[PDB]
Enzyme design. Structure first.
Site, short mmCIF file in Angstrom:
data_model
loop_
_atom_site.label_atom_id
_atom_site.label_comp_id
_atom_site.label_asym_id
_atom_site.label_seq_id
_atom_site.Cartn_x
_atom_site.Cartn_y
_atom_site.Cartn_z
N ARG A 16 5.01 -3.01 2.00
CA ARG A 16 5.53 -4.34 1.73
C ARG A 16 6.10 -4.51 0.33
O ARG A 16 5.69 -3.80 -0.60
CB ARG A 16 4.45 -5.40 1.97
CG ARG A 16 4.13 -5.60 3.44
CD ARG A 16 3.56 -6.99 3.70
NE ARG A 16 2.11 -7.02 3.60
CZ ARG A 16 1.37 -8.08 3.90
NH1 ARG A 16 1.95 -9.20 4.32
NH2 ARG A 16 0.05 -8.03 3.78
N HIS A 54 3.33 0.48 -5.87
CA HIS A 54 2.44 1.03 -4.87
C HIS A 54 2.02 2.42 -5.31
O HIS A 54 2.68 3.04 -6.14
CB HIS A 54 3.11 1.09 -3.50
CG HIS A 54 3.30 -0.25 -2.86
ND1 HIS A 54 2.24 -1.00 -2.39
CD2 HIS A 54 4.42 -0.96 -2.60
CE1 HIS A 54 2.71 -2.13 -1.88
NE2 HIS A 54 4.02 -2.13 -1.99
N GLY A 55 0.92 2.90 -4.75
CA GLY A 55 0.48 4.24 -5.07
C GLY A 55 -0.48 4.81 -4.05
O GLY A 55 -0.87 4.15 -3.08
N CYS A 107 -2.57 1.23 -5.88
CA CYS A 107 -3.62 1.86 -5.08
C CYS A 107 -3.71 3.33 -5.44
O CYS A 107 -2.73 3.92 -5.88
CB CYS A 107 -3.35 1.72 -3.59
SG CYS A 107 -3.49 0.06 -2.93
#
EC number: 3.4.22.61
Lengths: 4, 240
Positions: free
Chosen positions: B36, B95-96, B138
Protein backbone atom coordinates in the site's frame (compact mmCIF):
# COMPACT_ATOMS: atom_id res chain seq x y z
CA UNK A 1 -3.45 1.15 11.83
CA UNK A 2 -1.14 0.19 8.95
CA UNK A 3 2.26 -1.50 8.74
CA UNK A 4 5.40 -0.68 6.76
CA UNK B 1 33.38 11.74 29.88
CA UNK B 2 33.99 12.20 26.15
CA UNK B 3 31.33 14.00 24.11
CA UNK B 4 31.31 14.43 20.33
CA UNK B 5 31.95 18.01 19.20
CA UNK B 6 28.61 19.58 18.27
CA UNK B 7 29.05 23.32 17.83
CA UNK B 8 28.87 23.95 14.08
CA UNK B 9 25.92 25.82 12.53
CA UNK B 10 24.51 23.95 10.74
CA UNK B 11 25.47 20.77 12.61
CA UNK B 12 25.37 18.88 9.34
CA UNK B 13 22.93 17.55 6.76
CA UNK B 14 19.80 15.64 7.70
CA UNK B 15 18.68 13.50 4.75
CA UNK B 16 15.03 12.42 4.64
CA UNK B 17 14.09 9.67 2.18
CA UNK B 18 10.30 9.78 2.20
CA UNK B 19 8.66 6.96 0.24
CA UNK B 20 4.88 7.17 -0.17
CA UNK B 21 3.78 6.04 -3.64
CA UNK B 22 4.41 2.34 -4.30
CA UNK B 23 2.57 2.04 -7.62
CA UNK B 24 5.78 0.93 -9.37
CA UNK B 25 6.18 -1.85 -6.80
CA UNK B 26 2.57 -2.98 -7.26
CA UNK B 27 3.05 -3.01 -11.03
CA UNK B 28 6.48 -4.59 -11.43
CA UNK B 29 6.98 -6.92 -8.44
CA UNK B 30 4.46 -9.83 -8.21
CA UNK B 31 5.28 -10.36 -4.52
CA UNK B 32 4.21 -6.79 -3.70
CA UNK B 33 1.03 -6.68 -5.78
CA UNK B 34 -0.96 -5.19 -2.90
CA UNK B 35 1.69 -3.24 -1.03
CA UNK B 36 0.00 0.00 0.00
CA UNK B 37 0.87 3.66 -0.37
CA UNK B 38 2.35 4.87 2.92
CA UNK B 39 -0.37 7.39 3.79
CA UNK B 40 0.61 9.68 6.66
CA UNK B 41 4.36 9.44 6.02
CA UNK B 42 4.48 13.22 5.46
CA UNK B 43 3.62 13.56 9.13
CA UNK B 44 6.97 11.85 9.89
CA UNK B 45 8.93 13.91 7.35
CA UNK B 46 7.42 17.06 8.84
CA UNK B 47 8.12 16.01 12.42
CA UNK B 48 11.71 15.10 11.52
CA UNK B 49 12.09 18.45 9.75
CA UNK B 50 10.76 20.47 12.70
CA UNK B 51 12.81 18.52 15.22
CA UNK B 52 16.22 18.53 13.56
CA UNK B 53 15.85 22.09 12.33
CA UNK B 54 15.40 22.98 16.02
CA UNK B 55 18.64 21.08 16.58
CA UNK B 56 20.29 23.23 13.86
CA UNK B 57 20.57 20.66 11.07
CA UNK B 58 20.04 21.44 7.40
CA UNK B 59 17.17 19.27 6.17
CA UNK B 60 17.40 17.65 2.73
CA UNK B 61 14.09 15.92 1.90
CA UNK B 62 13.69 13.52 -1.04
CA UNK B 63 10.22 12.16 -1.87
CA UNK B 64 9.29 8.88 -3.58
CA UNK B 65 12.68 7.30 -4.28
CA UNK B 66 13.41 4.04 -6.05
CA UNK B 67 16.38 1.98 -4.87
CA UNK B 68 18.70 3.33 -7.57
CA UNK B 69 17.50 6.85 -6.75
CA UNK B 70 18.35 6.31 -3.08
CA UNK B 71 21.85 5.08 -4.01
CA UNK B 72 22.37 8.14 -6.21
CA UNK B 73 21.35 10.41 -3.32
CA UNK B 74 23.63 8.73 -0.79
CA UNK B 75 26.52 8.74 -3.25
CA UNK B 76 26.05 12.51 -3.63
CA UNK B 77 26.30 13.19 0.10
CA UNK B 78 29.11 10.64 0.33
CA UNK B 79 31.16 12.68 -2.15
CA UNK B 80 30.27 15.99 -0.49
CA UNK B 81 32.57 17.84 1.90
CA UNK B 82 31.36 17.73 5.51
CA UNK B 83 34.52 19.35 6.90
CA UNK B 84 32.56 22.24 8.42
CA UNK B 85 29.94 19.82 9.76
CA UNK B 86 30.01 18.00 13.10
CA UNK B 87 27.44 15.35 12.27
CA UNK B 88 25.47 13.55 9.57
CA UNK B 89 21.93 12.19 9.77
CA UNK B 90 19.95 10.02 7.33
CA UNK B 91 16.25 9.21 7.83
CA UNK B 92 14.59 6.57 5.64
CA UNK B 93 10.77 6.21 5.61
CA UNK B 94 9.57 3.30 3.50
CA UNK B 95 8.40 -0.27 3.38
CA UNK B 96 10.88 -2.96 4.27
CA UNK B 97 11.67 -6.56 5.09
CA UNK B 98 14.40 -8.40 7.01
CA UNK B 99 17.62 -6.42 6.66
CA UNK B 100 16.36 -4.30 3.77
CA UNK B 101 14.21 -1.37 2.78
CA UNK B 102 12.09 -1.17 -0.37
CA UNK B 103 12.39 1.55 -2.97
CA UNK B 104 9.12 2.82 -4.44
CA UNK B 105 9.79 0.45 -7.34
CA UNK B 106 9.75 -2.49 -4.94
CA UNK B 107 13.43 -3.27 -5.37
CA UNK B 108 15.46 -4.03 -2.26
CA UNK B 109 18.23 -1.96 -0.69
CA UNK B 110 20.07 -3.81 2.09
CA UNK B 111 20.47 -1.53 5.12
CA UNK B 112 24.20 -2.25 5.44
CA UNK B 113 24.72 -1.15 1.82
CA UNK B 114 23.15 2.16 2.83
CA UNK B 115 25.12 2.83 6.01
CA UNK B 116 28.47 1.64 4.63
CA UNK B 117 28.54 4.43 2.04
CA UNK B 118 29.54 6.81 4.83
CA UNK B 119 32.36 4.88 6.46
CA UNK B 120 35.46 6.90 7.33
CA UNK B 121 37.28 5.70 4.22
CA UNK B 122 34.42 6.42 1.81
CA UNK B 123 33.58 9.76 3.44
CA UNK B 124 36.79 11.14 5.06
CA UNK B 125 35.26 14.55 5.87
CA UNK B 126 32.96 12.68 8.27
CA UNK B 127 35.77 10.66 9.87
CA UNK B 128 35.67 10.95 13.66
CA UNK B 129 32.14 12.35 13.35
CA UNK B 130 28.81 10.78 14.38
CA UNK B 131 26.78 9.33 11.54
CA UNK B 132 23.17 8.65 12.54
CA UNK B 133 20.66 6.56 10.60
CA UNK B 134 16.98 6.29 11.44
CA UNK B 135 15.11 3.52 9.64
CA UNK B 136 11.29 3.53 9.71
CA UNK B 137 10.17 0.31 8.02
CA UNK B 138 9.11 -3.28 8.66
CA UNK B 139 11.87 -5.84 9.04
CA UNK B 140 9.54 -8.74 8.31
CA UNK B 141 5.84 -9.58 8.36
CA UNK B 142 5.50 -11.06 11.85
CA UNK B 143 3.56 -9.37 14.62
CA UNK B 144 5.74 -8.82 17.67
CA UNK B 145 3.92 -10.50 20.54
CA UNK B 146 3.33 -8.95 23.96
CA UNK B 147 4.18 -10.14 27.45
CA UNK B 148 2.48 -9.20 30.75
CA UNK B 149 4.45 -7.24 33.36
CA UNK B 150 3.62 -5.52 36.65
CA UNK B 151 3.19 -1.76 36.29
CA UNK B 152 48.42 10.50 13.94
CA UNK B 153 45.69 8.47 15.65
CA UNK B 154 43.74 5.75 13.82
CA UNK B 155 40.21 4.54 14.61
CA UNK B 156 38.03 1.88 12.89
CA UNK B 157 36.48 2.57 9.48
CA UNK B 158 32.99 1.83 10.82
CA UNK B 159 33.36 3.96 13.96
CA UNK B 160 30.90 6.58 15.21
CA UNK B 161 27.75 5.05 13.71
CA UNK B 162 24.30 5.03 15.31
CA UNK B 163 21.57 2.94 13.72
CA UNK B 164 18.03 3.44 15.00
CA UNK B 165 15.73 0.67 13.79
CA UNK B 166 11.96 1.10 14.28
CA UNK B 167 11.70 -2.61 14.99
CA UNK B 168 13.66 -5.77 15.75
CA UNK B 169 14.24 -8.09 12.81
CA UNK B 170 11.45 -10.31 11.41
CA UNK B 171 8.71 -8.02 12.70
CA UNK B 172 6.46 -5.21 11.50
CA UNK B 173 6.53 -1.56 12.49
CA UNK B 174 3.37 0.55 12.63
CA UNK B 175 2.09 3.62 10.80
CA UNK B 176 -0.96 5.61 11.84
CA UNK B 177 -2.04 7.48 8.66
CA UNK B 178 -3.57 10.21 10.86
CA UNK B 179 -0.61 10.59 13.23
CA UNK B 180 2.51 9.12 11.65
CA UNK B 181 4.55 6.11 12.72
CA UNK B 182 4.96 4.92 16.30
CA UNK B 183 8.75 5.08 16.08
CA UNK B 184 9.36 8.43 14.36
CA UNK B 185 6.67 10.38 16.25
CA UNK B 186 7.98 9.01 19.55
CA UNK B 187 11.59 9.69 18.52
CA UNK B 188 10.90 13.32 17.59
CA UNK B 189 8.90 13.95 20.77
CA UNK B 190 11.70 12.57 22.96
CA UNK B 191 14.35 14.49 21.02
CA UNK B 192 12.56 17.84 21.37
CA UNK B 193 11.91 17.22 25.05
CA UNK B 194 15.28 15.88 26.17
CA UNK B 195 17.93 17.43 23.88
CA UNK B 196 17.53 20.89 25.48
CA UNK B 197 18.05 19.09 28.81
CA UNK B 198 21.42 17.86 27.55
CA UNK B 199 20.56 14.16 27.46
CA UNK B 200 22.52 11.95 25.10
CA UNK B 201 21.02 10.02 22.20
CA UNK B 202 21.35 6.58 23.84
CA UNK B 203 19.30 7.78 26.80
CA UNK B 204 16.71 9.27 24.44
CA UNK B 205 16.57 6.10 22.33
CA UNK B 206 16.11 4.15 25.55
CA UNK B 207 13.10 6.36 26.36
CA UNK B 208 11.84 5.77 22.81
CA UNK B 209 12.13 2.02 23.42
CA UNK B 210 10.09 2.48 26.60
CA UNK B 211 7.41 4.60 24.89
CA UNK B 212 6.87 2.46 21.79
CA UNK B 213 6.87 -0.64 24.01
CA UNK B 214 3.73 0.66 25.73
CA UNK B 215 1.80 1.05 22.49
CA UNK B 216 -0.67 -1.63 21.38
CA UNK B 217 -2.12 -2.80 18.10
CA UNK B 218 -5.53 -3.89 19.37
CA UNK B 219 -6.58 -5.32 16.00
CA UNK B 220 -3.92 -8.05 16.02
CA UNK B 221 -2.71 -7.85 19.63
CA UNK B 222 0.63 -6.65 18.28
CA UNK B 223 3.49 -4.73 19.81
CA UNK B 224 6.56 -3.01 18.36
CA UNK B 225 10.11 -3.13 19.64
CA UNK B 226 12.61 -0.57 18.27
CA UNK B 227 16.27 -1.57 18.22
CA UNK B 228 19.24 0.83 18.23
CA UNK B 229 22.72 -0.34 17.22
CA UNK B 230 25.85 1.78 17.61
CA UNK B 231 29.62 2.04 17.22
CA UNK B 232 29.70 5.42 18.96
CA UNK B 233 32.87 6.04 20.95
CA UNK B 234 31.61 9.20 22.65
CA UNK B 235 28.41 10.57 24.12
CA UNK B 236 26.22 12.09 21.42
CA UNK B 237 24.27 15.21 22.40
CA UNK B 238 22.42 17.76 20.28
CA UNK B 239 22.66 21.21 21.94
CA UNK B 240 20.02 23.77 20.97
Amino acid sequence: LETX
Amino acid sequence: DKVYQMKSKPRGYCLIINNHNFAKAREKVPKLHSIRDRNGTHLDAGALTTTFEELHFEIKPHDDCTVEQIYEILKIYQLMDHSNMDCFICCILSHGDKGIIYGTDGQEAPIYELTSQFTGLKCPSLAGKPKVFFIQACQGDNYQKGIPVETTRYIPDEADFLLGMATVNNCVSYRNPAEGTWYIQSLCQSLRERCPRGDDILTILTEVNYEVSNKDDKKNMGKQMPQPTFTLRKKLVFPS
